[PDB]
Symmetry: C4
Subunit: 210 residues, 4 copies
Amino acid sequence: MERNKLARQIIDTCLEMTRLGLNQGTAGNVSVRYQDGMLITPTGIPYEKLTESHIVFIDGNGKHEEGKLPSSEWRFHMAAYQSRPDANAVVHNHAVHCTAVSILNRSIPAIHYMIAAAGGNSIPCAPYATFGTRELSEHVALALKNRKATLLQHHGLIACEVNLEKALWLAHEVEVLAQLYLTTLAITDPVPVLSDEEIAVVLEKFKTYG
Amino acid sequence: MERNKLARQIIDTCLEMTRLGLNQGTAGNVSVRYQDGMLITPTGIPYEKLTESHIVFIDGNGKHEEGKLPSSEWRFHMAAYQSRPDANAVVHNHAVHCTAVSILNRSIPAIHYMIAAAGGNSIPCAPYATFGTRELSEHVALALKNRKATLLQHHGLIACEVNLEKALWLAHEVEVLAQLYLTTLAITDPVPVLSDEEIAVVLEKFKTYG
Amino acid sequence: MERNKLARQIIDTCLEMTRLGLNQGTAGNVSVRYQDGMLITPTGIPYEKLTESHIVFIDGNGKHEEGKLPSSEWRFHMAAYQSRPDANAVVHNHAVHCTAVSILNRSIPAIHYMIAAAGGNSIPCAPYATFGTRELSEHVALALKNRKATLLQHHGLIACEVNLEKALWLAHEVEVLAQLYLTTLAITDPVPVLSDEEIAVVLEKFKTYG
Amino acid sequence: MERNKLARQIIDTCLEMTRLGLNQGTAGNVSVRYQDGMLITPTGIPYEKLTESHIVFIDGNGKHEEGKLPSSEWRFHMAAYQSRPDANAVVHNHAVHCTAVSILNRSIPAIHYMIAAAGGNSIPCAPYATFGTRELSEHVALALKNRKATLLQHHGLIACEVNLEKALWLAHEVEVLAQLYLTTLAITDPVPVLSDEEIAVVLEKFKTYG
Ligand SMILES: [Co+2]
Ligand SMILES: [Co+2]
Ligand SMILES: [Co+2]
Ligand SMILES: [Co+2]
């Protein structure tokens, strides 16, 4: 839990996120909870030019390290941390499938049992607001109250977890769910879904096993 | 046929499965028939952290090696082995295209002659049941009676063969067939198919040649 | 133009074909014109296990090297060579997009000016016949009379050129055209096309430049 | 700003463009503003065979280096430079998604806030004209007057920026926007969009921040 070791992980996540195809238009940003604020990726630096020294610390008051510019989307990383105390890492991206569903402003219903990984029977879509604004931050905080991931209308996705590895994994899983929903929707509307009781059993089962 | 050599192959299949794009949401599991039970991948370990020592042995009674947790989906790997005696390896995954067709709960009809590789004129879809349950196991055993691969409703795919290489190959082929069917279905419903007689000739021909 | 040097190229094409995503379900086969027949890939050997010694020679009478099994689809490689004297290499595959269009049994019309690379204002689709048969061979020979590539109904694609590099390039280009057509067709039917006169000018222009 | 250093960058862009999946059918061409004309990729040489010596200089009169053949599409690279004085690099390709939208001859409306990166509330589609002609050049110059990227009907995409890195980045971003639009269009027509005022705020915000 040394800063430089947290800085590397953040960087490895950016690289890996790219490897998985979630980092298109190189618009993602990643952060972790640290001290009284967070460590986040900087604005204006393509992932492959990133070194541990580029990682920016932002305290709990919204004040950042001198001489360093944090991601232009840092504000909702702070909203996520304040909304979900258990969240230790946040991954945001503009993955294509998640984004297309968010353009239709639809939530992703229970078309697959893995939807329980985000905490319930759906992946919500928070209403649109200009990036970097406090109003966008509010919509995000409200959607994450009972879910670990949310689509953001005409924008992309935010997923949070207890560490970077799980957060990355969740984000990747929502992208798959997103592609599954668009694919079936083009054939039939609405898409068949699993019932609320059936999702209740899977949730209980995930609580049991891990 | 030494355990450690079987353990490596299992691992190479996981890696290769990932390379082919079948391992999204890192949800797959692979096993081989061994002694009176099987060797299978463990639960809770991302494929790249896998070493031969992580591979778990489960006997014919459903009892596993002490201190090791087998895949959460092991039960249907055992059902596959007991349903198809000739099966020596099983590959399961949540490949996107196969899954979307399974969400529509449709079987894949004869839109291409390679559909004969699974044993007939279709790839069935077994009804949904909670993962890890005996009821899911039953539906699987019944679908594999006359086919080597089956879709699992709102879940994914199970393919079995005489060795890991062929099982992996079959799984990959069903994914292609799955993508071909979704693509055409979005344009026309129903999708033109080859007749039962025509599939009868290809099957005979595959019996002849190999 | 030594056999072993032709054998390597064939192998590099298989690898590269795979790299481009045309070799799914590992069903492709590649050949070149050699002496009085051709050199072709063997049946039953996954591309990465291929060595120059696995390449099989088939004379003009349809008789192959002793102890070696040529691709199960060799017959139409011979039909292509006898139909188009100028053809020196043939590439066949079951690329997904080309195959989906072939399942709809539609020819690809002039939706893009690069369609002129195959010789006219379309990529035809030859009617279906069991693989490896003389009747399939006839349909292929007839479609290649005025085009360098053709879709094969419920099967895949055959593209021929003056060398392996161009043949591979053409095959790749038809796959792109195929994906472009399916994508637009799902939105609008029929898809807008360029006129015959406009394709006449591009053809003349390609004759001029190269 | 030495020619050989500009030549390498051009080459790295071709490689990277390919890596991103924009270079299908190997039809792209890239140039930079240099002296009184430009440096551009040559015609007839697959990207991996490219060396700095293959890069061709074309002066402001349309006259090129002796013994070297520039891209067959150089003319609109010159039109782009003369239309947008601030443009220092041009990237052209036949990316699949951009091309499909261009086949429908539709402009890409404001379905995502990143559309502001091209300069306004849309990505236009310039009418079709035979490649390499002065009439095609006119349509391009006119579309780039108020935008940095444009689709070209039944053809592909042209994106310009202040350096190769940003031009490549823009091209990649339009491809993502293109895929987002086709995906949603197959489900609903028309696709919901952000208002002109909302795009006005994002533009102002990008002016502010960078
Ligand atoms: Co964002
Ligand atoms: Co499963
Ligand atoms: Co074939
Ligand atoms: Co062009």
